[PDB]
């Protein structure tokens, strides 16, 4: 499901992140050798962590927000979020006619736009495959005409099967709440819910 | 249309169901205002420019009156309302504050054409007057909780201040020995109350007005200004040493504030003519401070 | 809030005039005020433009009422270009301070009315103000 | 037994709730696998936690509040707590001619209003059955004719017997006062009582 | 030698490669200064008396200009540079701040004999003018990051302010109903930016100058002063109650600031003649605040 | 009309003038930047310039109007170089001391109109203000 | 910004051939920031002139010898030779600028670009205007 | 790989080091006997610890820095850190004609400059060999003709083979980014990124 925000529900401008913390969580078997060399082995999967802080929420906005959150807690599905700082539409066009040749594993990826896309995805922008819900981060870009060579920080979780389509816009993190067990909201005498915050965490 | 002139006004204080129209009023100052909760919800989605401000409370008003002394001594009711105990025409400062909450009263500020401003839940928080070479006048300071605009009002036709008392030079004594070279005797009395804000979530979408308050302390104080005068070399009566306990009285022909035992601190200023300044407060075990109000012929 | 019935109309010379009133019923009991529109049944609007408020004042013109889309509450008040010319003919030669194109043409007010919807003639004034002619250049 | 609030007792304005804290307590066993998939397990029940804060209290206000609290601790009753922000009257009418089909044990109430109720409940409101004291929040509501589809956050604590009647307005939390083992209030030299806090928990 | 007179000066603002010489300047004030790091290393070995002071940064300059209204309306560029969107001759206050960083421009203060002071990385942070019974004038306030002395400069021969606009009495309306008894309408607009100090260890032994800044908020505000006037007993239009949303416009013959929806707070002063004071800010969902600039004949 | 939206046109001497409008209705309640270009099919705008703002004024020039893109919403108001020369000849000579390039020529308005079968007169005024001539030397 | 945008001042230096280099570029800002492309200046002729005053009867003190150095890339150049600079300096006001004594007023100028082509779009625009100043010199 | 600093990238002035912290990490086993004699034992190696602090970062500065850090974490390279305070150029010339006698495994380098180097290194400067990435600090220096006697704090991590060449200028720390397991940066509502810190450790 979709986390409410001013893009989906413009009538509630109180929704919307006062501050978002996009943390990098890659567990590693780090070992500090006696000779000065540091050896680290990556085994556990990496996952983005999102910490959302909300401004002063009025009673109706908080009613909508916690209604959506409780629906999340009820039906048990995943909770998608859209970070707005990465919503710079730097790539126009429709990506259905873009083919990613099969048999690709690792950080590097090669995709052929077939002369369809307009706009260059600069380093630091997000990237997501059509099938898998993992969200990557472009670290370097290099194109030779139509073919694009993109390097992603997390290695491709699944090897491309030749049908996965690039998603350069409207990327949603498939996250799970981490504050659900004890989630309280305080109501002031001024009439606003203060200090509403979420500690999300990408699942899979 | 109807303008509102300060000179064309009448201030009536409503206590116990009777209107105390305080004539002989030299000048008064008051203001009304509201409290707002203005927050700006700038977000990464929309870095907005328009605030979210709602008016939810009335800021307490601070009304100050300057009242001349009068022959009917209605102005002593300000000491009476501020907490002093009464015996005859003399007001005592009680050893302990009588009640937790002050004495509440309403006040009207009348004007022409049925125009009025209604201050409610008022209490007298300050009264100070300077006995000097000018006509004495006591500036009272009251704090309101709720102000309002009303059409009909209470007007004190009968209860009113009489003629102003003629000037009479002040004199300060120790027992019956006069203190020489007086300049300006200033007396101060206070009832330092505090508003108990009880704005709760049941008052959301409503305007809140302060209603209840409690007395933090009462006190009587006086600052005496003299000229540094000595009659002997190494004098004992007049010097700069502190006096732990000494009977003092700041006397006039129409008023006499008595400190049965006083704690005096002295301060010398090397000005054009040397001036000493006293700081008179009653002691710990001193008897109640007296304030006599003599209309005429004592 | 309070009352804001007083609004001044600036009609254009040589151009027909038409105003579109979206009648509405806002209630501030709930914090997001209700957007319920009033339902226009048994409603008629009447409005005349008369120079000055003194009794016996000549009728400069008369508004032509239109009731459309009664369900959603909107309504239209208008008057033909001939009425505009008749208004502009009798307008004063003195021009407005803030705009040197407007000239005071008269006063106006429109009055809603319920005609025996409950056997009651509940007619009250909607709005009021002054009508200003804006001198054109095209014709 | 009702907790004193400025609805029933406006003569004591200090008894108002300076700030309420509706805490969502749903203990779960959350385990994060190394493959990036976070998994949860729910066994225990969800209970609404209410925290009340108070301003300085005059002797009469404190006397009334303390008498009520001691009456509670004497009879061992259940404090009822009313939240003003949840008292918006949307559904009006009779709740006795409405029928709830039996056998509903999930997290969703299907009821035939029989056209006897005006208005519609809004998401995020408070809902409660007439035969159980647990309080529910409406997370979603779809109306198809007279039959309503109300979705609730806590899974239905009872299986509907067909005699339950929905309650939308006048809902109270059947709380039990926690932190009553060491309950006190300091009296200052100015005559007002300070340091009064009610940590309440929904003891259905 | 060459002295520098303020009256013999010319202020040219350099934006987009064009010089905006702002004539009709009533008065301007500016200052330049440096930041020091002065520490005294008193030790048990040597309780020294001589400090260790090094100049390492330029304190940002605060330049204030007072500019008369002109017929060519060059002064509206200050609203344009401060962040307002433009359509025709009217400036809108955008719902959200457009960019993170303000609009930067350079400014010259020319004087005779090729003397000049070059303020760089400037931004307009405040603009406020009072519509009153005196000639209106808008005091702009800009903050600089780097100041310098240069020999040749940019002089706005063509882009200049015309003749000052004649005085015209202000008037404030609600829709089209005039508000009676106006005293002084003061409007205020701000772009409350903040310098981002990035002084690092690579700038040691060098003079640092602020270069980049970000916009904390923009706002439009107005304080209206009236006389307390009432036309009826228990009037509804004119009273002291707050107004959550009401259309307001502070209109003149040459300028009109429009608040499509305003939040008004009132404050009554019991002065010689009672005065009420408004505090007008746009509401949360109000349409953009208008500022029209009419040169002549609207 | 739009009394608050008066804009003064500036025409360069010795240069053909050109100004283009875009009729593009908006509805941002659903989402910001929801703007749909208005169809201008069977619309015909027209205007004029007169020396003074009153009846009996001498006409100076009439804009050569056009509809550049039908159904796209891009209308154009313009006049050829000879008309600009006539304006420069007819313009006043009270040159400002600090804007010595601009002289006042007259006042202008333009009216859009609907000429649709199955419809009626829909004239509406969309522009208003003054026409200022900017002096030129390069001819 | 009715006319404030297309006006800049030129200061021709005495005893030096004055040449100003112009680079046309179609900058797109409303749709998206930081997007600019050159204007294809083929068939986009330029012409300018200088006159002492703005009256109807004014003297043509000089005229720019405009040239399009690059047909594409939107690069053009307006320049005048040494003789024209000398004529301007001789035919200039004797009143010196106080803030810069070397500069004296010479006259006014305009620049019109005429994009005459086969397509019926023979439009003309005034892209520049302002005042012309002469900066005195001694090296001769 | 070089960490972005305002030497290579002055267009991003926010990437400067607001405060560096050169930490001397030499773990030792210190035992204090009751007879007042404190005794130490050293086994493990000494590694220079570098801590970098940053000011508020604009979107472009943070984009560049984050792209570089993600490139590091992708290729598993070694961040090179340059400290400006240690870039005083004293020794100038060619370091290829200088010879270092082999078999030197202590804490002291004896090298014959062969008269090819001008100037003399100062105590407390940074010194490094050309065949090993460990960074040394000169604690003492005595020159007797062309042969130099450079004393280093860390005991020589390699035994000189006779082919090493001293490096005095342009010395970089072959660091590895610690605290990268949970690396994040909060984006405030004003558009600037805050809370960025680099805890680096010299992974020779």
Q: Cβ of E19 and G4 within 8 Å?
A: no
| Contact between chain B and chain G (3 or more Cβ pairs less than 8 Å apart) | no
Candidates B83, B170, B181; CA nearest to B125 is B83
Helix/strand/coil for A85: coil
| CB atoms inside a 10 Å sphere around CB H68 | 21
Test mutation, E23, E89, E253, chain F, max F CBs within 10 A = E89
Question: Which ranges of B86-242 would DSSP assign to H, the alpha helix?
Answer: none
Tell me which chain G residues have a C-beta less than 8 angstroms from the C-beta of E156.
Answer: 9
Backbone angles phi, psi at A146, to 5 degrees: -90, -35
H47, H200 contact by CB (below 8 A): no
Dist. CA A43–CA B142, nearest whole Å: 74
- Contacting residues of E for F96, CB less than 8 Å apart: 71, 162-163
Residue A164 CB partners (closer than 8 Å, separation 6+)? A100, A129, A130, A131, A132
DSSP D145-164: TTEEEEEESSPPSS---S--
**Can you give the three-state secondary structure of chain F, one letter per residue?**
CCHHHCCCEEEECCCCEEEEEECEEECCCCCCCCEEECCCCCECCEEEEECCCCCCCCEEECCCCEEEECCCCEEEEEECHHHHHHHHHHCCCCCCCCCCCEEEEEEEEEEECECCCCCCCCCEEEEEEEEEEECCCCC
In this complex, whether H and F touch, counting 3 or more CB pairs under 8 angstroms, is no
Backbone angles phi, psi at B173, to 5 degrees: -120, 155
Q: Which two tokens stand for residue B247?
A: 């009977």
In this structure, the number of other CB atoms found within 10 A of the CB of residue A41 comes to: 9
Structure tokens at D136: 């529910």
C-alpha C125/C-alpha C110 separation (Å) is 6
Which two structure tokens, joined as six digits, stand for E156?
């706005």
Q: Is E158 helix (H, G, I), strand (E, B) or coil?
A: coil
Shortest CA gap B201–chain A (Å): 5
Q: Do C98 and E247 touch (CB under 8 A)?
A: no
- Cα end-to-end span (Å), chain G: 41
Identify the experimental approach.
cryo-EM
Q: Chain A within 8 Å of D21 (Cβ-Cβ)?
A: yes
How far apart, in whole angstroms, are the C-alpha atoms of residue H190 and residue H101?
Answer: 60
Instruction: Give the whole-angstrom CA distance, residue E113 versus residue E116.
Output: 9
Q: Which two tokens stand for residue F111?
A: 């009216």
Instruction: Output b/e per residue, C31-49; b: 16+ Cβ within 10 A.
Output: eeeeeebeebeebebebbb
D190:B215 CB<8 A: yes
The two counts, helices (H) then strands (E), for chain G are 1, 10
Chain A within 8 Å of D43 (Cβ-Cβ)? no
Q: How many other C-beta atoms can be found within 10 angstroms of the C-beta atom of residue E52?
A: 10
Q: Which of H4, H27, H73 to mutate to test the interface with A (most CBs of A within 10 A)?
A: H73
Which residues on C lie below 8 Å from E247 (Cβ)? 4
Tell me how crowded residue B219 is: count the other CB atoms within 10 A of its CB: 13
Question: Whose structure tokens read 């369900």?
Answer: C71
CA–CA gap between residue B180 and residue A149 (Å, rounded): 101
Q: For chain F, first and last CA: distance in Å? A: 37
Verify whether the Cβ–Cβ distance B47 to H191 is below 8 Å: yes
Say yes or no: C135 contacts chain E, CB-CB below 8 A: no
DSSP state letters, chain D: -BPP-TTT-TT-GGGS-SEEEEEEE---EEEE-TTS-EEEE--SPPEEEEEEE---B-HHHHHHHHHHHHHHHHHT--EEE--GGG-----EE-SSS-B--S---SSEEEEE-TT-EES-PPTT-EEEESS---EEEEEEEEEETTEEEEEESSPPSS---S---EE-SS--EEEEE-S-TT---EEPTTS-EE--EEEEEE--
Strands (E), G24-102: 25-28, 35-38, 45-51, 60-62, 67-70, 75-80
B42 CB neighbours in chain H (<8 A) are 189-190
Contact residues on chain F for G108, CB-CB shorter than 8 A: 137
D42 to chain A: closest CA residue: A181
Tokens linked to H5:
């600093």
For chain D, list the contacting chains (3+ Cβ pairs, <8 Å): A, B
d(CA F111, CA F134): 25
Chains in contact with C via at least 3 Cβ–Cβ pairs below 8 Å: A, E, F
Q: How far is E204 from chain G (nearest CA, A)?
A: 34
> Is H183 an 8 Å CB contact of chain A?
yes
Picking from G64, G62, G84, the residue whose alpha carbon sits closest to that of residue G21 is: G64
How many whole angstroms separate alpha carbon F80 and alpha carbon C38?
A: 52
CB contact F8 to E (< 8 Å)? yes
Residues of B in contact with H191 (CB under 8 A): 44, 47
CA E192, E195, E196 angle in degrees (round to 5)? 130
Q: How far is CA C138 from the centre of its chain?
A: 25
Please spell the DSSP secondary structure of C46-72, one letter per residue. Answer: EEEEESSSSTT--EEEE-EEE---TTT
Please tell me if residue F98 touches chain A, with a CB cutoff of 8 Å: no
Spell out a b/e string for H120-148, using b for 16 or more CB atoms within 10 Å of the CB, else e. Answer: ebeeebbbbbeeebbbbbbeebeeeeeeb
Three-state DSSP class for residue H190: coil
Under DSSP, the state recorded for C85 is H
Tell me, yes or no, whether chains E and F touch by having 3 or more C-beta pairs under 8 A: yes
Query: 3-class SS at G112?
Result: strand
Rounded (5°) CA angle A69-D26-A47? 60
User: Which residues in chain C are closer than 8 Å to A59, comparing Cβ atoms?
Assistant: 31
B23: left (phi over 0), alpha (psi -120 to 50) or beta: beta
**Contact in structure between B36 and B56 (CB atoms under 8 Å):** yes
């Amino acid at each position: 499901m979709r986390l409410p925000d001013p893009y989906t529900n413009p009538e509630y401008p109180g929704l919307g992140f006062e501050s978002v913390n996009l943390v990098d969580n890659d567990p590693m078997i780090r070992d500090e050798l006696p000779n000065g060399k540091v050896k680290e082995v990556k085994i556990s999967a990496q996952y983005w962590g999102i910490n959302i802080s909300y401004p002063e929420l009025f009673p109706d906005e908080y009613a909508f927000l916690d209604s959506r959150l409780l629906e999340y807690k009820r039906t048990g599905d995943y909770l998608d979020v859209l970070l707005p700082q990465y919503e710079a539409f730097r790539v126009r066009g429709d990506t259905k006619s873009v083919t990613i040749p099969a048999g690709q594993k690792g950080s590097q990826i090669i995709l052929n736009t077939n002369g369809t896309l307009t706009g260059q995805p600069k380093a630091g922008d997000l990237f997501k495959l059509s099938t898998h819900p993992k969200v990557y981060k472009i670290t370097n870009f290099s194109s030779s005409g139509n073919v694009w060579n993109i390097s992603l920080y997390p290695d491709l979780f699944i090897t491309t099967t030749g049908s996965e389509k690039p998603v350069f816009n409207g990327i949603l993190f498939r996250t799970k709440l981490m504050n659900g067990d004890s989630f309280g909201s305080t109501l002031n005498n001024n009439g606003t819910y203060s200090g509403i915050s979420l500690s999300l965490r990408e699942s899979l | 249309m109807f303008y509102s002139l300060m000179r064309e006004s009448k201030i009536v204080i409503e206590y116990d169901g009777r209107g105390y129209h305080f004539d002989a009023l030299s000048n008064y100052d008051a203001s009304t205002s509201f409290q707002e909760f203005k927050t700006l919800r700038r977000t990464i989605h929309n870095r907005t420019n328009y605030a979210d401000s709602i008016i939810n409370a009335q800021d307490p008003s601070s009304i100050s009156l300057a009242i001349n002394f009068s022959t009917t001594l209605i102005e002593s009711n300000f000491f009476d309302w501020m907490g002093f105990t009464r015996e005859g025409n003399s007001l005592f400062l009680p050893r302990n504050t009588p009640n937790i909450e002050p004495i509440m009263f309403n006040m009207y500020i009348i004007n022409h054409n049925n125009s009025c401003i209604y201050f409610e839940n008022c209490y007298v928080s300050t009264v100070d007057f300077s006995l000097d070479k000018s006509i004495p006048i006591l500036n009272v300071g009251i704090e309101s909780g709720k102000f309002s605009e009303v059409s009909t009002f209470r007007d004190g036709y009968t209860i009113t201040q009489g003629e102003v008392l003629p000037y009479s030079a002040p004199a300060v004594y120790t027992n019956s020995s006069p203190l020489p070279a007086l300049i300006s005797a200033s007396m101060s009395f206070q009832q330092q109350c505090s508003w108990r804000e009880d704005r709760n979530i049941f008052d959301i979408n409503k305007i809140y007005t302060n209603k209840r308050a409690y007395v933090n302390e009462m006190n009587a104080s006086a600052t005496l200004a003299f000229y540094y005068v000595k009659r002997l070399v190494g004098d004992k009566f007049l010097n700069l040493d502190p006096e732990t306990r000494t009977p003092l009285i700041i006397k006039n022909k129409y008023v006499s504030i008595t400190f049965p035992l006083a704690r005096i601190s002295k301060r010398l200023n090397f000005s054009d003519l040397y001036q000493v300044e006293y700081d008179v407060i009653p002691t710990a075990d001193s008897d109640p401070v007296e304030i006599n109000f003599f209309g005429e012929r004592k | 809030s309070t009352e804001n019935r007083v609004i001044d109309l600036v009609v254009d010379e040589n151009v027909p005039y038409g105003l579109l009133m979206q009648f509405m019923d806002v209630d501030d009991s709930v914090y997001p005020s209700t957007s319920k529109p009033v339902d226009l049944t048994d409603f008629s609007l009447r409005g005349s433009i008369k120079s000055s408020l003194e009794d016996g004042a000549e009728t400069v013109a008369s508004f032509t009422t239109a009731i459309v889309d009664a369900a959603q509450g909107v309504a239209s008040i208008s008057l033909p270009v001939s009425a505009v010319t008749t208004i502009a003919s009798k307008a004063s030669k003195e021009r407005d301070r803030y705009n040197p194109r407007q000239r005071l043409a008269g006063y106006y007010d429109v009055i809603i009315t319920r005609t025996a919807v409950g056997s009651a003639a509940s007619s009250f004034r909607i709005m009021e103000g002054k009508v200003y002619i804006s001198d054109g250049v095209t014709q």
